[PDB]
């Protein structure tokens, strides 16, 4: 039921269950040009049931929206969607 990150054709695909449906949904991101803020906006656009979304470091520090997805994906992070927190573990890719 978690959030997964899987590279397909060289790009990260992030799959998540959103609050309003059981059908999981996947988001493909461009690491070098998309930011954290872009991903969060896509989540909100996909599900109007989302009131709150944010990404945190494993230590619980909020990640800036302008941070590139490539930088975020170098390590674990937390994704908060409404009242649920997901621990996300991306595969270690160089930089
Ligand atoms: Mg995935
Ligand atoms: Mg991280």
Curated annotation (Swiss-Prot):
Its main location: mitochondrion. Induction: MCU transcripts are down-regulated by microRNA miR-25. Down-regulation by miR-25 may protect cardiomyocytes against oxidative damage in cardiomyocytes. The modification Phosphoserine is found at residue 20. Changing residue 20 to A: Decreased MCU current. The keyword Repressor does not apply. GO terms for biological process: calcium import into the mitochondrion; calcium-mediated signaling; cellular response to calcium ion starvation; glucose homeostasis; mitochondrial calcium ion homeostasis; mitochondrial calcium ion transmembrane transport; positive regulation of insulin secretion; positive regulation of mitochondrial calcium ion concentration. Residues 3-93 are annotated as: N-terminal MCU domain. It comes from the Eukaryota. Changing residue 25 to A: Abolished glutathionylation in response to reactive oxygen species. It is found in: Mitochondrion inner membrane. Phosphorylation by CaMK2 in heart leads to increased MCU current. The regulation of MCU by CaMK2 is however subject to discussion: another group was unable to reproduce these results. Phosphorylated on tyrosines by PTK2B/PYK2, promoting oligomerization. The keyword Nucleus does not apply. The modification S-glutathionyl cysteine is found at residue 25. GO terms for cellular component: calcium channel complex; mitochondrial inner membrane; mitochondrion; uniplex complex. One of its GO terms (molecular function) is identical protein binding. Changing residue 20 to A: Impairs calcium uptake, but has no effect on oligomerization and interaction with MICU1 and MICU2. The selectivity filter, in which calcium ions are arranged in single file, is composed of two acidic rings separated by one helical turn along the central axis of the channel pore. The N-terminal MCU domain is required for efficient Ca(2+) uptake and for interaction with MCUR1. It is not required for targeting to the mitochondria, oligomerization, interaction with MICU1 and MICU2, or assembly of the uniplex complex. Belongs to the MCU (TC 1.A.77) family. Channel-forming and calcium-conducting subunit of the mitochondrial inner membrane calcium uniporter complex (uniplex), which mediates calcium uptake into the mitochondrial matrix. MCU channel activity is regulated by the calcium-sensor subunits of the uniplex MICU1 and MICU2 (or MICU3). Mitochondrial calcium homeostasis plays key roles in cellular physiology and regulates ATP production, cytoplasmic calcium signals and activation of cell death pathways. Involved in buffering the amplitude of systolic calcium rises in cardiomyocytes. This is Calcium uniporter protein, mitochondrial. The lineage of its organism: Eukaryota, Metazoa, Chordata, Craniata, Vertebrata. The gene is MCU. The chain holds residues 73 to 167 of 351 of the full protein.
């Amino acid at each position: 039921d978690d959030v997964t990150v899987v590279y397909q054709n060289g790009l990260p695909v992030i799959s998540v269950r959103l609050p309003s449906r059981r059908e999981r949904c996947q988001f493909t991101l461009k690491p070098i040009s998309d930011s954290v803020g872009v991903f969060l906006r896509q989540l909100q656009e996909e599900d109007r049931g989302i009131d709150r979304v944010a990404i945190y470091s494993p230590d619980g520090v909020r990640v800036a929206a302008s941070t590139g997805m490539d930088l975020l994906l170098m390590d674990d992070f937390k994704l908060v969607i409404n009242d649920l927190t997901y621990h996300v573990r991306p595969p270690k890719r160089d930089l």
